[PDB]
Design a protein around this ligand. Structure first.
Ligand SMILES: CN1CCN(c2ccc(-c3ccncc3-c3cc(F)c(O)c(F)c3)cc2)CC1
Length: 301
């Protein structure tokens, strides 16, 4: 072997100026940062910092998986990872900075969305999910908090729910993660989180955005789970027949019979009547205008 070293200009946390704390949680802390040095100097990013001491084995395994998945993904509707580095006591992920907020913050203000907006948000999401499926990846927590918006108003699916289907299948017996209300019957019964389970959560999110409420929810965790399994849902009648049809096809308890599980795959969702006004090629090319868009006294002659 050749005992010669490769020269490189490595990144470290001191190349990123701290602007403000965007959020905090069990995962760690998120900051808005400004790159100081390099070709991307002055560029803004979201910096997620995880303390190695406030980190379980499962937490360390999970972070490594998210980083590896993000390095493998390039899609217009999924968050991009720009950097990953570590210190003796901390782990850093440098991701896209998204100024448009999240779908949950927006849902809480509006109470409910129009079919026009739900059709736009779900169509971009369907593309993001199918791209993940093409790489053997599933989304274990498809809640509206995990979908951010950019300056234009296009969606960006976060990394927080990213899991590999092969890894998830081997751990399913000793692993119970995610938000209960969004779980497919087979996930509640620990039979495994398949691509079909992503299309059930996709319908839960659809129902919540259109009606302002979750379709299967009880007085506690236990009741919600039994409700997901019995699955006897009343369809709000202010919903269009197209929205109602899509919801019933997605809320099929047998994962094999659920819309998207068939031979055509995502084409079963794409060709549904609810999405007939969507040009899927133009949408992917970000050529479709978002129906919603996120974010002096003196006068003289
Ligand atoms: C409990 N909350 C705490 C705050 N949290 C939260 C989520 C997103 C953000 C956030 C805000 C703005 N831009 C990017 C991110 C971001 C995106 C990702 F894909 C991440 O992986 C990440 F780390 C940060 C800011 C806070 C959501 C969950």
């Amino acid at each position: 072997t050749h005992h010669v070293k490769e020269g490189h200009e490595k990144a470290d946390p001191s190349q990123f100026e701290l602007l403000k704390v965007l959020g905090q949680g069990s995962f760690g802390k998120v900051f808005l940062v400004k790159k100081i040095s390099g070709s991307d100097a002055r560029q803004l990013y979201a910096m997620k910092v995880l303390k190695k001491a406030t980190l379980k084995v499962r937490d360390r395994v999970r972070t490594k998986m998210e980083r590896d998945i993000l390095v493998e993904v390039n899609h217009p509707f999924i968050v991009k990872l720009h950097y990953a580095f570590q210190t003796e006591g901390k782990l850093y992920l440098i991701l896209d900075f998204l100024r448009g907020g999240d779908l949950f913050t927006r849902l809480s203000k509006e109470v409910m969305f129009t079919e026009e907006d739900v059709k736009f948000y779900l169509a971009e999401l369907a593309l993001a999910l199918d791209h993940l499926h093409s790489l053997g990846i599933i989304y274990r927590d498809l809640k509206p908090e995990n979908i951010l918006l950019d300056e234009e108003g296009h969606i960006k699916l976060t990394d927080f729910g990213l899991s590999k289907e092969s890894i998830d299948h081997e751990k399913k017996a000793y692993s119970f993660c995610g938000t209960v209300e969004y779980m497919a019957p087979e996930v509640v019964n620990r039979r495994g989180h398949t691509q079909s389970a992503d299309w059930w959560s996709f319908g839960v999110l659809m129902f919540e955005m259109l009606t302002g409420t979750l379709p299967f929810q009880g007085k506690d965790r236990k009741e919600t789970m039994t409700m997901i399994l019995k699955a006897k849902l009343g369809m709000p009648q202010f919903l269009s027949p197209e929205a109602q049809s899509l919801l019933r096809m997605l809320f099929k308890r047998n994962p094999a019979n659920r819309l998207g599980a068939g031979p055509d795959g995502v084409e079963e969702i794409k060709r549904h009547s609810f999405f007939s006004t969507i040009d899927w090629n133009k949408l992917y090319r970000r050529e479709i205008h978002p129906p919603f868009k996120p974010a002096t006294f003196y006068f003289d002659p």
